[PDB]
Structure 1
């Protein structure tokens, strides 16, 4: 955590929660593009995933 500011705030990716959200999504993309899903799932429905 960090103390609050009284300047105007804006969504930022610096926050740890954001980092956690980013890594899991990034990691899953690797699950979708793994060999365990390349052989079964069609490629056109893998780019949507």
Structure 2
């Protein structure tokens, strides 16, 4: 629809006061879970044997 754009990630309006790093954004969540999974992989039995 005219004057609209789509965006692969969730989005928010521009913040009001100063910015700062946060940890509840979609990307941050994606990062944390991904790392958590691979850590689980590394500790799996398949790695331990070798």
TM-score above 0.5, yes or no: yes
RMSD: 0.7
- The two structures have a TM-score, normalised by structure 1, of 0.76
1:11 alignment partner in structure 2: 21
Which has the higher Rg, Structure 1 or Structure 2? 2
Specify every segment of 5 or more residues in structure 2 that has no aligned partner in the other structure, as ranges: 1-10
4+ residue stretches of structure 1 with deviation over 6 A? none
> What is the aligned residue count?
40
Specify every segment of 5 or more residues in structure 1 that has no aligned partner in the other structure, as ranges: 41-49
- The two structures have a TM-score, normalised by structure 2, of 0.74
